[PDB]
Amino acid sequence: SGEYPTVNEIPVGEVRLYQIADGVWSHIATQSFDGAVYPSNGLIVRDGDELLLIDTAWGAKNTAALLAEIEKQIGLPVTRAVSTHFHDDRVGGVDVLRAAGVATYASPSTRRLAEAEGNEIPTHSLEGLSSSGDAVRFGPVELFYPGAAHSTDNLVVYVPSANVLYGGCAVHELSSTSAGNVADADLAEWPTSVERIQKHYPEAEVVIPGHGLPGGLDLLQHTANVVKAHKN
Ligand SMILES: C[C@@H](c1cccc2c(-c3ccc(CS(C)(=O)=O)c(F)c3)c(C(=O)O)[nH]c12)n1cc(CNS(=O)(=O)CCN)nn1
Ligand SMILES: [Zn+2]
Ligand SMILES: [Zn+2]
C-alpha distances (whole Å) from 92 to each of 71, 75, 153 are: 20, 23, 16
Query: What distance in Å separates the CA atoms of residue 185 and residue 216, rounded to the nearest whole number?
Result: 23
CATH code assigned at 106 = 3.60.15.10
Beta strand 50-54 pairing with 78-82: parallel
Q: Is residue 195 part of a domain?
A: yes
Asked if 200 is an active-site residue, the reply is: no
14 contacts: CB under 8 Å, gap ≥ 6: 29, 30, 65
The three state secondary structure string of the chain is CCCCCCHHHCCCCCEEEEEEECCEEEEEEEEEECCEEEEEEEEEEEECCEEEEECCCCCHHHHHHHHHHHHHHCCCCEEEEECCCCCHHHHCCHHHHHHCCCEEEECHHHHHHHHHHCCCCCCEECCCCCCCCCEEEECCEEEECCCCCCCCCCCEEEECCCCEEEEECCCCCCCCCCCCCCCCCCCCCHHHHHHHHHHHCCCCCEEEECCCCCECCHHHHHHHHHHHHHHC
7, 90, 154, 181: residue to mutate for ligand 1 pocket, most atoms within 8 A of CB: 181
Kindly give the distance from the C-alpha atom of residue 63 to the centroid of ligand 2, in angstroms, as a whole number.
17
Q: Is residue 151 part of a domain?
A: yes
**Resolution reached, in Å?**
1.4
Give phi and psi for 195, each to the nearest 5: -60, -35
Q: Is residue 1 part of a domain?
A: no
Asked if 87 is an active-site residue, the reply is: yes
Q: Is residue 2 part of a domain?
A: no
Q: Are 44 and 15 in contact (CB under 8 A)?
A: no
Asked if 124 is an active-site residue, the reply is: no
Q: Is residue 39 part of a domain?
A: yes
Kindly give the distance from the C-alpha atom of residue 181 to the centroid of ligand 1, in angstroms, as a whole number.
3
How many folded domains does the chain comprise?
1
> Angle at CA 54, nearest 5°, toward 100 and 204?
160
| Solved with | X-ray
Query: What distance in Å separates the CA atoms of residue 155 and residue 144, rounded to the nearest whole number?
Result: 6
Domain containing 226 equals: 7-231
